[PDB]
Amino acid sequence: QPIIQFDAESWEAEFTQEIQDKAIEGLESGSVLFFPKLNFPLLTEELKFLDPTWVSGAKNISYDPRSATLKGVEGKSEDLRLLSGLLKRYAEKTAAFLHLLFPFYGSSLKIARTSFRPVEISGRATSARKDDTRLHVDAFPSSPTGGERILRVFSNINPQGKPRSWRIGEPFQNYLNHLLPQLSPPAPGKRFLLYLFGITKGYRSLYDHYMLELHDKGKLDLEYQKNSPQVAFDFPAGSTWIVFTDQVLHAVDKGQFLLEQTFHLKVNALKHPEKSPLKLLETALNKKLVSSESFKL
């Protein structure tokens, strides 16, 4: 069941326990939670930001809600104030919604960076590694997770009714199994040098090493990209969806104007930790893949 649909229409909706159970079971099973009527409206004075010229450099426009800091865009203070207010409002609304929907996670949800993506996808072109028309789970070479989950909320805010076209692939366990013959341990000392030289933010755990290998090798596996099970779905303008993007194989084919919020969640806060990429990888390789793991018993 790759996509599970929900009726909630408001960022302040309250949920029955039955819907909460449907959401957490589906999320942790690697389904996309889809909210077709959950629109994120913009203020009239924000409509000018529906314009790709606001991206000033090679990075995405991003906002850190913890520090209230906006990056990746230049301009007058008043325009940066307005754009910060837009992304802050998305951080607030998505965080409130997740706390209404997932009480089981309690205060273990840790908000990370908000992003605004005004560039049309179908004109993009990058290296094969960075090409997100290729199915992948999320792993970022400069930003190891240490095993923590990457939970993302997406809202299509296209003002011309254009959908955002995704493809959703097969379960993580099958992807891992497909690529397992291709996995290899890191060269000794290499990750230590990446840390010492400032290439990585923190030390890249073995978990992060293997998630990057899965990400990169899966993108280079052209037969797998072509033939693996996958469904194409158009997320309509004015819809919202929620995904563990480190677990759900996904690719983005076209669309323009997206708000995105990243949260992190420790594995031991999950209802079924054994379903996490970390635990599936530790099982498949029979080893501890994050050295800072808490010790039980």
Ligand X SMILES: CCCCCCCCO[C@@H]1O[C@H](CO)[C@@H](O)[C@H](O)[C@H]1O
Compute the least distance from the CB of residue 240 to Cl ion, in Å.
12
Could you give the strand order of the β-sheet that contains 61-64, starting from the edge strand earlier in sequence? Answer: 3-5, 32-35, 240-244, 149-156, 258-265, 110-117, 61-64, 69-71
Instruction: Give the SS3 label for residue 85.
Output: helix
What's the rounded Cα separation, in Å, for the pair 217 and 129?
Answer: 9
For residue 138, the partner it binds in Co ion, ligand X, Cl ion, none, with Cβ less than 5 to 8 A by kind, is: Co ion
Closer CB to Cl ion, 15 or 263, in the complex: 263
Residue 7 in marked binding region: no
Neighbour count for residue 116 (Cβ, 10 Å) = 24
# chain residues binding ligand X, by CB under 6 A: 7
The number of angstroms, rounded, from the C-alpha of 195 to the middle of its chain's C-alpha atoms is 24
Is residue 192 a contact point for Cl ion (CB under 5 A)? yes
Here's the x/- map for Cl ion, 123-152, by CB under 5 A: it reads as: -----------------xxx----------
For residue 233, the partner it binds in Cl ion, Co ion, ligand X, none, with Cβ less than 5 to 8 A by kind, is: none
Kindly compute the dihedral angle of the four CA atoms of residues 176, 20, 154, 244, in this order, to the nearest 10 degrees: -20
Compute the least distance from the CB of residue 92 to ligand X, in Å.
9
Compute the least distance from the CB of residue 277 to ligand X, in Å.
25
3-state SS of 133-191 is CCCECCCCCCCCCCCCEEEEEEEECCCCCCCEEEEECCCHHHHHHHHHHHCCCCCCCHH
Is residue 138 a contact point for Co ion (CB under 5 A)? yes
- Partners of 70 in the β-ladder: 63
Is residue 260 a contact point for Co ion (CB under 5 A)? no
Is residue 17 a contact point for ligand X (CB under 6 A)? no
Is residue 12 a contact point for ligand X (CB under 6 A)? yes
Query: Which residues inside 236-265 make contact with Cl ion, applying CB under 5 A?
Result: 252
Query: Which residues inside 79-108 make contact with ligand X, applying CB under 6 A?
Result: 96, 99-100, 103, 106-107
Residue 136 in marked binding region: yes
Residue 166 in marked binding region: yes
# chain residues binding Cl ion, by CB under 5 A: 7
Question: C-alpha angle 87/21/18, rounded to 5°?
Answer: 110
Known binding-site residue numbers: 117, 136, 138, 152, 164, 166, 250
